[PDB]
Design a protein around this nucleic acid. Structure first.
Ligand SMILES: [Mg+2]
Ligand SMILES: [Mg+2]
Ligand SMILES: [Mg+2]
Ligand SMILES: [Mg+2]
Ligand SMILES: [Mg+2]
Ligand SMILES: [Mg+2]
Ligand SMILES: [Mg+2]
Ligand SMILES: [Mg+2]
Ligand SMILES: [Mg+2]
Ligand SMILES: [Mg+2]
Ligand SMILES: [Mg+2]
Ligand SMILES: [Mg+2]
Ligand SMILES: [Mg+2]
Ligand SMILES: [Mg+2]
Ligand SMILES: [Mg+2]
Ligand SMILES: [Mg+2]
Ligand SMILES: [Mg+2]
Ligand SMILES: [Mg+2]
Ligand SMILES: [Mg+2]
Ligand SMILES: [Mg+2]
Ligand SMILES: [Mg+2]
Ligand SMILES: [Mg+2]
Ligand SMILES: [Mg+2]
Ligand SMILES: [Mg+2]
Ligand SMILES: [Mg+2]
Lengths: 48, 269, 186, 165, 174, 288, 318
RNA sequence: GUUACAGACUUAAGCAGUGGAGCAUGUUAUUUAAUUCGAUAAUCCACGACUAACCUUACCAUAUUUUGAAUAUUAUAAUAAUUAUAAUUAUUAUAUUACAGGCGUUACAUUGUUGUCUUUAGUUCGUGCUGCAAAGUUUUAGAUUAAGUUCAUAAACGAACAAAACUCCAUAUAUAUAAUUUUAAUUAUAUAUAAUUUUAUAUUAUUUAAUAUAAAGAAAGGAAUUAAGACAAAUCAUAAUGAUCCUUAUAAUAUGGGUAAUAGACGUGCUAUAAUAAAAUGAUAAUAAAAUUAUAUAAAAUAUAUUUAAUUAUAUUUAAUUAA
């Protein structure tokens, strides 16, 4: 496809006035939070 | 004027509805870049008698949008029963189609007669002077790579040639010259643009003509016309050359004109 | 009922008129493709109507044969390959052919058609230019000037009585007029 | 429930909608002009930028818009206004479109080949090869300079290294 | 919706009997009551031959039948040269053979599409239709013979899972 | 039909007059005008298209395909309400339909249709009381199919009382409605001494339940099984003693007790008539 | 005989009597079965266009949900977009739902969103889209006042908004409300009435033709042919689909907190056969050759705590 | 592991096959560093897979990546676009955590979809009525149909999802259009009409229903649609999601290898075992349809295999057309 296509990121750039909500992202964040709460969060990544 | 919303200073003397409309326009046009104005506020206050809202309340609403409205003040009414005041999806689609039809009818009625102003009689270029036919193709909405394709096509007898030179030209053409229909055509897709391709084709044609008219130590009188490609093409296609025998016909057996007396009586003109 | 419905309305209500062909000098043929009929047929009818007024002797929607792009597919996401479903797509094709018109009129027609185009319908145009055998792009500057003059004549505002105007077209005209444009070639 | 405001059709309104490929000379110039405007990123197919919005004057037509290989995301560059806007309008493009001028490359002569290689038969073979290449490259569409470079490489006048840059 | 067949039959019986009353003795009232319950030709051409188009399978046969002495020309060549199988020729003849008019009518057939036997059948079909114009009284006879019926037998398509139209791939139990 | 310019101006606006004139010039007087059967360009009704309609044409300022406006200009900046509402009459109601305690009124209306009963009486004077409110099920091949069973005594509190049962797979409100309907269909005049209690001490068997209902002195209240009490409240019995033996199946009590009232009781007057004797009530004669 | 011939030549009308056609108010254009209404000659380009359209749909869906200072999250439901690709221009369009004269003086979040689509001079969404298509784009929102006029919206709304009413089990009140959306319309009666109206119209036109009549097939003037025929009388009667006759809504998946297994729960109302096609000239037609025109089916699958579930909706529309 | 009737490719005829041979392909088993994973009674076995050289691939060996494909948060710095040498924005770079990612495990957590019962004829709701009631009647005593479609009868009367019908293909007819060089008008394509055919004479059984005969008609098929429930049937390898497990590794890239291994076994096919059947030849080129050709279709012709040349196969080189 055309890699330059409008994304949710841009929907903040174009229309700052409207406080949009990306639903899938929000859901993912909620899931992550739940995982953190119940001791099933991701282990901290090794750097070395 | 059209550019009226942009100047909030001018509109105090307008009616209230008009002022409201201008305000709404202003809000629309500069959505995120909206910045309140004193004159505009004053206008809005003046309008307040139109739609039943107090003077402090209107000002508060202007200052704070939806939050202010909330402060001034609900049940879910999603599955509230049907009051029969709105068409469904299919219905609405059918209506839209009908609107489109009506629009097109209107166009046909009042714009196409106007279009007949821009009307010119045909100015024919004679086949004697203009035998060659450069056909160009154009795909309207798309950007096809066949839009560059141009096709020159000429009857070889229509070209200004002597008989010896004509034969030589035909020989040079090879597969491009058909012999059943005395036609030579060629297309070019080599170049980027259509005009370029047409020019190239023209140049080729000119070169071919120059070669035909040479005759100096190169006649091609004793190379017969190769018609193999044409016969191959004919084989690929089908033929309906056969016809009804002319001696099998029977004009005497044909149905004669039957006498209709009432029709005859009618025809007094 | 004492209400005079003029001729244009009547014409709209009835089938579209067609002007007769004086000479068989096929100037342009326009093929209309679409994945269905109703819109396409309507569009063709509209094209014919506008062609009548622009006096173009258009012939009419000769239906060229429909295509059929078939594709079969196993219904399931996994195995059950004994059950299979077909799919098809019909490219409906209609042909218009303009027969006697001075190029400018034809261009206008085509431009008008593409302006008020319909949803489902694609379009292709084959234009035909009966030129002489020998040609010359040597006497150039004068020919360019003539072309510019012709363009100017074509796109002149006769009476500004709230007529249709285009900003891009005006810009194009301005560019054509300019000294820089004239200079280009030499 | 109101009167139909009939705006009269005009050639000017039907300008832009003129076919991109039409035989006429007059039409060709117009088409070229339209193409030049499009290249410049003039507001065709879109509402113009004027001195009303100041911050949000964005465009998507950057040097490599719908392309992958240049590493970036969507770049919202600010558009000029209708004033302070330049038009590209290059001569080579005009020559290509309005007139039907084409380059055709140059056939490599035998003398040039003799400059490098010694033997006659080998030179003749090289010349033949160059000729063969030329017609193929004319047929293909690539780019004025790039195509020429390729042709040179094929001939042996330039080495293979000049391609990989 | 509450009307039954038996009721309708009864009603018909009632009406019919009333109608049957000798027209001379009938009344105005009866007739008023009963009032409620009421409710292109082919020809030869300029040259005197009957064109007719017949079809079978993929074949199409436009056939010019004319009154001259009985000779055949299929598709611009002799009949024995075109149709090699005698069966096809016999089939073609059959419309002229059900009538006693083989030898009477010159026939100029022009076929397209399909194979030879199907083409011959389409020609035959066309000829019967052509003959029907020359004498309309024989039309019923031709129909009875089975020549005026367009043979519908159409090649069934290959269905998805099946190999051919009906031929399925082998079944297994174990 | 080629009309004059002045006539056209009288009926048509000044903008389209030129276009009309042009059409007249172009199209000759001798014109055939064929009827296109295979495609219909124009609508199925006559309309001079000079007037743009609100509903049946596109809204002018609104954006769409065939806009014929600039990308900037679209006069439509409020999207709270609907843009193109329905023309002429606001509704699209079919023939014989209307727009939207109430349940009791609906019941009464339905009864009035079905069986000619007075709706107003049903609404006001009758008062209902659910006695049993089961959920009940059937083992079908699909599965266990539950069904809400109600049993609802209704009664004007002047000796007019009726029991009714009803059933719905859908929720219990519907079942109760049905039970109420049934009760009003089955209204029944019970006899009662002094408009407060039964005549004699009755002892009646309905299926399982063995009933025993003693009469009562005035002031002594209802002292009986809860179902019986409920039925008495509706049927206007103020004073009653009694006790249920054997089965105490609520439904069968409810059915049995109304049967006992209607059947086991004999009014004094009826007894007197049968026997041919005076049958005085001593207390009444005394004047308490 | 001449008069009869003339009538035969001109004998056309709206379909639906027992020389007739299905008018543009009597059936759907088969183009309105597909969502990318396009033909291009280069099929690669067409594919690219339809991809773009699909990507824009997702973007639009994303936009549709707003927030108000983390107080209220008004989820505007939108239909699947339909993209009309004329030669000149694209036009995107969708149907949407949103849940005293005090609000003349502030712009609502939904209003702002709608304004963004086409009204923001340079900044608007249509302008930005135009770069992807190389033609002028026009987004038209269409407001629906009810949830159940469009099938997609109905299914989508239930998936997103009314979670709590069915997550453990379908609450009784909610179920009742679903059941009694429409007032149980006698669909047989309505179809029959419509047919009668069509017949009457046909008779009227025929009568007019007769009156006019008292080798060329031209009748009288237009005014006299269409004597009683007007915009006020005909169009709305002829309009085919108007009445949600019957509808079915199915909830399916893990919609039970106690139970591990799934739960198919179906609500059924009215009827899904159409009686206008049963006894008249108008015939039924099939969208994508498998969905009766009058039907419109859709589903939308929101994720729960327990896992995935969906909500089929299916309406009939006489 | 039950009665009784009715049904059809069920059986019976019949035609051609499988089962023997060799090969192809899938499966099994075993092998292997890896032979990736699933499908595996009917309802797996040229199935998922409409093409496994690399890639695709998921498997294996050896190498090497570690915020990685995203979104957001917090900072430094650099370039470009816009404005009237500063600033606003957009991006990029380096980092910074939450994480990203997972064809890992469970279709006995799910979605959607599909298979089989199934184009089978079943599956239920209002009002009335029966039963104390759960329930029953309707939804069947007969009969008939392909059929819960229908007439006879019946405490029933109507109404829905199925059935039928509308739908598509094909057919016949009519109208329109096609300057009969994009022609095939013997066509193509829009719009109609047409039949689940009708009528009458007789012969059997009771006004009708089957047979026969006749006269009227072009009138004779195929496709899609496969309900409810069930099989914890198939799919987490289309995709998505719940729970759970991996986070310098169960995530990511390259080079090669493997998926093509071979004792026996099992399906599907292909080619065969010669004269009611195989091979040479057949240019005024015997007779088709359907479909593809801008990520192309490749004509004629020259050259070699080949002393004539044709055939067949390559090469040489692209004529024509992006297409009635
Ligand atoms: Mg009872
Ligand atoms: Mg058998
Ligand atoms: Mg064996
Ligand atoms: Mg074997
Ligand atoms: Mg697995
Ligand atoms: Mg395996
Ligand atoms: Mg590998
Ligand atoms: Mg994860
Ligand atoms: Mg992996
Ligand atoms: Mg599943
Ligand atoms: Mg599994
Ligand atoms: Mg039952
Ligand atoms: Mg049953
Ligand atoms: Mg069916
Ligand atoms: Mg022809
Ligand atoms: Mg089922
Ligand atoms: Mg299982
Ligand atoms: Mg399962
Ligand atoms: Mg999973
Ligand atoms: Mg996955
Ligand atoms: Mg990895
Ligand atoms: Mg394998
Ligand atoms: Mg198989
Ligand atoms: Mg043999
Ligand atoms: Mg060849």
């Amino acid at each position: 496809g055309n890699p330059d296509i409008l994304k949710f990121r841009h929907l903040k750039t174009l229309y700052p006035d409207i406080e949009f909500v990306d639903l899938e992202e929000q859901y993912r964040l909620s899931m992550v939070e739940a995982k953190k709460r119940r001791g099933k969060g991701a282990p901290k990544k090794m750097k070395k | 004027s059209a550019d009226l919303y942009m100047h909030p200073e001018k509109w105090k003397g307008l009616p209230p509805q008009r002022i409201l409309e201008l305000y709404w326009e202003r809000m629309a046009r500069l959505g995120s870049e909206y910045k309140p104005n004193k004159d505009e506020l004053n206008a809005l206050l003046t309008t307040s008698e139109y739609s039943n809202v107090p003077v402090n309340d209107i000002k508060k609403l202007y200052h704070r949008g939806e939050q202010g409205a909330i402060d001034i003040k609900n049940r879910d009414n999603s599955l509230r029963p049907f009051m029969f005041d709105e068409l469904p999806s299919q219905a609405q689609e059918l209506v839209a189609q009908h609107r489109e039809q009506r629009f097109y009818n209107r166009l046909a009625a009042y714009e196409l007669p106007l279009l007949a102003q821009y009307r010119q009689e045909y100015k024919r270029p004679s086949p004697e002077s203009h035998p060659v036919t450069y056909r160009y193709t154009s795909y309207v909405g798309e950007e096809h790579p066949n839009s560059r394709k141009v096709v020159l096509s000429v009857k070889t007898k229509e070209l200004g040639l002597e008989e010896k030179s004509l034969h030589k030209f035909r020989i040079l053409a090879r597969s491009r010259y058909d012999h059943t229909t005395d036609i030579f055509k060629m297309s070019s897709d080599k170049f980027e643009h259509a005009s370029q391709n047409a020019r190239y084709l023209h140049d080729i044609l000119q070169r071919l003509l120059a070669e035909s008219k040479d005759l100096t130590e190169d006649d091609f009188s004793d190379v017969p016309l190769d018609t193999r490609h044409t016969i191959a093409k004919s084989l690929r296609k089908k033929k309906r050359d056969y016809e009804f025998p002319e001696h099998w016909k029977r004009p005497e057996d044909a149905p004669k004109k039957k006498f209709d007396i009432v029709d005859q009586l009618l025809s007094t003109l | 009922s004492t209400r005079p419905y003029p001729v244009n309305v009547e014409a709209v209500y009835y089938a579209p008129l067609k002007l007769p062909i004086k000479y068989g000098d096929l100037v342009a043929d326009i093929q209309l493709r679409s994945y269905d009929n109703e819109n396409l047929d309507f569009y063709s009818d509209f094209i014919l109507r506008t062609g009548y007024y622009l006096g173009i002797p258009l012939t009419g929607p000769k239906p060229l044969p429909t295509r059929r792009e078939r594709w079969t597919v196993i219904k399931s996401p996994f195995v059950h390959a004994k059950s299979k479903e077909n799919f098809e797509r019909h490219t409906h094709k209609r042909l218009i052919r303009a027969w006697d018109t001075n190029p400018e009129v034809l261009q206008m027609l085509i431009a008008y058609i593409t302006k008020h185009s319909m949803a489902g319908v694609g379009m292709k145009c084959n234009f035909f230019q009966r030129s002489e055998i020998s040609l010359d792009l040597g006497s150039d500057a004068n020919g360019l000037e003539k072309s510019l003059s012709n363009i100017d004549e074509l796109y002149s505002l006769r009476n500004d009585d709230k007529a249709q105007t285009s900003a891009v077209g005006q810009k194009v005209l301005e560019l054509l007029d300019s000294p820089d444009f004239k200079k280009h070639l030499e | 429930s109101s009167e139909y405001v009939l705006e009269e059709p005009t050639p000017l309104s039907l300008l832009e909608y003129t076919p991109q490929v039409f035989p006429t000379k007059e039409s060709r110039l117009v088409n070229f002009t339209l193409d030049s405007l499009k290249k410049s990123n003039y507001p065709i197919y879109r509402s113009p930028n004027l001195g009303i919005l100041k911050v949000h004057d964005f465009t998507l037509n950057t040097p490599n818009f719908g392309k992958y290989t240049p590493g970036s995301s969507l770049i919202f560059a600010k558009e000029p206004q209708l004033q302070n806007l330049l038009i590209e309008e290059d001569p080579e493009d005009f020559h290509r479109q309005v007139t039907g001028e084409y380059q055709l490359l140059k056939p490599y002569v035998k003398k040039d080949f003799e400059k490098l290689t010694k033997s006659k038969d080998t030179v003749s073979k090289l010349v033949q090869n160059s000729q063969v290449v030329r017609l193929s490259l004319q047929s293909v569409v690539m780019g004025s300079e790039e195509k020429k470079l390729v042709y040179d490489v094929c001939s042996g006048m330039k080495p293979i290294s000049e391609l990989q840059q | 919706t509450k009307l039954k067949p038996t009721q309708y039959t009864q009603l018909l019986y009632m009406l019919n009997k009333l109608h049957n009353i000798d027209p001379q003795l009938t009344n105005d009232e009866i007739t008023s009551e009963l009032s409620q319950y009421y409710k292109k030709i082919k020809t030869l051409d300029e040259f005197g031959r009957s064109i007719a188009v017949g079809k079978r399978k993929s074949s199409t046969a436009k056939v010019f039948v004319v009154r001259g002495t009985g000779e055949i020309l299929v598709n611009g060549r002799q009949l024995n040269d075109y149709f090699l199988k005698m069966k096809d020729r016999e089939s073609i003849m059959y419309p002229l053979q059900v009538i006693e008019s083989v030898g009477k009518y010159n026939i100029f057939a022009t076929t397209s599409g399909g194979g030879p036997t199907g083409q011959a059948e389409s020609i035959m079909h066309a000829i019967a239709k052509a003959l029907v114009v020359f004498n309309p009284l024989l039309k019923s006879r031709l129909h009875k013979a089975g020549v005026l019926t367009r043979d519908y037998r159409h090649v069934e398509r290959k269905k998805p899972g099946k190999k051919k139209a009906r031929k399925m791939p082998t079944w297994v139990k174990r | 039909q080629h009309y004059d310019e002045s006539l056209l101006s009288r009926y048509y606006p000044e903008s389209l007059l030129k276009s009309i004139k042009l059409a007249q010039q172009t199209i000759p007087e001798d014109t055939k005008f064929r009827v296109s059967r295979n495609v219909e360009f124009a609508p199925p009704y006559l309309d001079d298209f000079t007037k743009i309609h609100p509903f049946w044409d596109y809204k002018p300022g609104m954006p769409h395909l065939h806009a014929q406006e600039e990308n900037n200009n679209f006069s439509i900046f409020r999207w709270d309400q609907v843009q193109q509402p329905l023309p002429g009459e606001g509704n699209i109601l079919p023939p014989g339909v209307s727009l939207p305690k109430s349940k009791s009124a609906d019941v009464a209306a339905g009864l009035h249709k079905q069986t000619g009963v007075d709706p107003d009486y049903i609404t006001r004077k009758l008062t209902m009381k659910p006695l049993v409110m089961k959920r009940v099920s059937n083992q079908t091949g699909k599965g266990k199919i539950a069904s809400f069973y109600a049993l609802v005594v209704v009664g004007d509190k002047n000796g007019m009382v009726g029991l009714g049962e009803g059933k719905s797979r859908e929720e219990m409100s519907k079942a109760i409605f049905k039970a109420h309907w049934d009760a009003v269909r089955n209204l029944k005049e019970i006899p009662r001494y002094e408009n407060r209690t039964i005549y004699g001490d009755i002892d009646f068997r309905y299926h399982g339940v063995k009933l025993h209902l003693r009469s009562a002195k005035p002031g002594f209240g209802l002292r009986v099984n809860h179902v019986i009490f409920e039925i008495c409240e509706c049927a206007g019995i103020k004073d009653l003693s009694g006790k249920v033996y054997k089965s105490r199946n609520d439904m069968n009590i409810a059915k049995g007790t109304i049967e006992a009232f209607t059947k086991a009781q004999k009014t004094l007057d009826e007894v007197a008539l049968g026997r041919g004797k005076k049958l005085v009530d001593v207390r009444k004669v005394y004047y308490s | 005989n001449n008069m009869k011939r003339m009538l035969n030549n001109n004998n056309m009308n709206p379909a639906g009597a027992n020389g007739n056609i299905n008018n543009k108010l009597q059936h759907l254009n088969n183009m309105n079965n597909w969502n990318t209404q396009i033909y291009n000659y280069n099929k690669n380009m067409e594919i690219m266009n339809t991809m773009n359209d699909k990507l824009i749909n997702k973007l639009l869906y994303k936009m549709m949900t707003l927030k108000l200072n983390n107080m209220n999250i008004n989820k505007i439901i939108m239909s699947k977009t339909i993209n009309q690709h004329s030669l000149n221009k694209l036009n995107i369009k969708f149907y949407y739902y949103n849940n005293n004269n005090n609000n003349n003086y502030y712009m609502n979040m939904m209003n702002k969103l709608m304004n963004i689509m086409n009204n923001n001079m340079n900044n608007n969404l249509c302008n930005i889209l135009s770069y992807y298509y190389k033609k002028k784009v026009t987004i038209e929102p269409i407001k629906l006042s009810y949830i159940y006029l469009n099938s997609d919206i109905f299914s989508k709304y239930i998936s997103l908004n009314d979670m709590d009413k069915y997550n453990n089990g379908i609450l009784t009140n909610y179920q009742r409300m679903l059941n009694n959306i429409m007032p149980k319309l006698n669909d047989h009666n309505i179809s029959m009435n419509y047919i009668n109206n069509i017949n009457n119209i046909n008779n009227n036109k025929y009568n007019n033709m007769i009156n006019l009549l008292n080798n060329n097939n031209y009748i009288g003037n237009i005014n006299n042919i269409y004597n009683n025929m007007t915009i006020d009388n005909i169009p709305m009667d002829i309009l085919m689909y108007k009445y949600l006759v019957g509808w079915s809504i199915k909830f399916k998946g893990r919609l039970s907190n106690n139970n591990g297994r799934t739960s198919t729960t179906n609500l059924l109302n009215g009827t899904f056969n159409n009686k206008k096609y049963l006894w008249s000239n108008i015939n039924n037609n099939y969208k994508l050759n498998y969905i009766p025109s009058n039907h419109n089916l859709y589903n939308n699958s929101n994720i729960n705590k327990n896992g995935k579930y969906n909500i089929k909706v299916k309406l009939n529309f006489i």
